[PDB]
């Protein structure tokens, strides 16, 4: 019910986000997830880092280059959670995946394109209050992800731009809701109200 859906990764729980986003692909819907670095995992940071290290120990013994690949970027840590939830080795699998992109920060076209949240994967709705959790960006960095600051710099630059944009918007939506006021109470308006409009 949209050609492409763009999800703000912020405040979302990896596995549950991964679950919904994967079903979306297998049902034909294009997805792009942005702001992967402000994704959460439940349970405090030491446990999650520890987990990532357990994953780090796995490599093909005779040639570490053919053994499992350890991707450190938040976007790509997420891509792993997702991939495991899709028969990625079948034709249909590869197709499902190709409908999906993940980004750290939110790089252009998407930056002027609406984003949605996924409630059933939203931490604040989901995690019980008091329960400790983890920021995906912080976790990545600690296991070697290089671009935390770069993406941080780029985001504030973006956010300045977005504010100005949103401020013009609001100002315009003032003029409309204003200049409307006259028509807002007019015979046509009363008619529309009779039919619920």
């Amino acid at each position: 019910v949209e050609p492409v859906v763009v999800i703000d990764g912020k405040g979302h729980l990896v596995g549950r986000l991964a679950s919904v986003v994967a079903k979306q692909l297998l049902n034909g819907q294009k997805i792009v997830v942005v702001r992967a670095e402000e994704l959460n995992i439940s349970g405090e940071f030491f446990r999650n880092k520890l987990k990532y290290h357990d994953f780090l120990r796995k490599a093909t013994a005779f040639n570490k280059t053919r053994g499992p690949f350890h991707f450190r970027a938040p976007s790509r840590i997420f891509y792993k959670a997702l991939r495991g939830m899709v028969s990625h080795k079948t034709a249909r699998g590869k197709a499902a995946l190709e409908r999906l992109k993940v980004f750290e920060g939110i790089p252009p076209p998407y930056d002027k394109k609406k984003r949605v949240v996924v409630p059933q994967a939203l931490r604040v709705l989901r995690l019980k209050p008091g329960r400790k959790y983890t920021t995906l960006g912080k976790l990545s960095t600690s296991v070697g992800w290089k671009y935390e600051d770069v993406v941080a710099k780029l985001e504030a630059k973006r956010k300045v731009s977005s504010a100005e944009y949103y401020a013009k918007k609001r100002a315009f939506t003032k003029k409309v809701a204003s200049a409307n006021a006259t028509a807002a109470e007019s015979d046509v308006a009363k008619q529309l109200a009779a039919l619920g409009y």
């Binding site: 019910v1 297998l26 049902n27 034909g28 499902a96």
Partner: protein
């Protein structure tokens, strides 16, 4: 007359199947806007079309259609079951499908 559609959109998700055996004879469709088996009861018997392109023209057209119909609902979330004159190709798991408003017993 920007819009001309007289069908509801649907997606072709799977054949009927257990965990390790599928049954190509029945197809599972998710109709847009339908969330409960109660809702989906409205669509039972309606006709569906899967609509595709080909290279060879036939009746001077490169569009082709596989017809079928919704036969019962499926599970608790509005998914519906469908049989087709042929049997949906399978590469089409994820493809759009069209669910008409006739036969109408409005």
């Amino acid at each position: 007359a920007e819009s001309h559609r007289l069908y509801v959109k649907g997606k072709h998700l799977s054949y009927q199947r257990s965990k390790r055996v599928n049954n190509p004879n029945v197809s599972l469709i998710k109709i847009e806007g339908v969330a409960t088996p109660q809702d989906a009861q409205f669509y039972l018997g309606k006709r569906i079309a899967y609509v595709y392109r080909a290279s060879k023209e036939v009746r001077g057209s490169k569009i082709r259609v596989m017809w079928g119909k919704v036969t019962r609902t499926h599970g608790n979330s509005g998914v519906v079951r469908a049989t087709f004159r042929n049997n949906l190709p399978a590469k089409t798991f994820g493809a759009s499908v069209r669910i008409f408003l006739y036969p109408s017993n409005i």
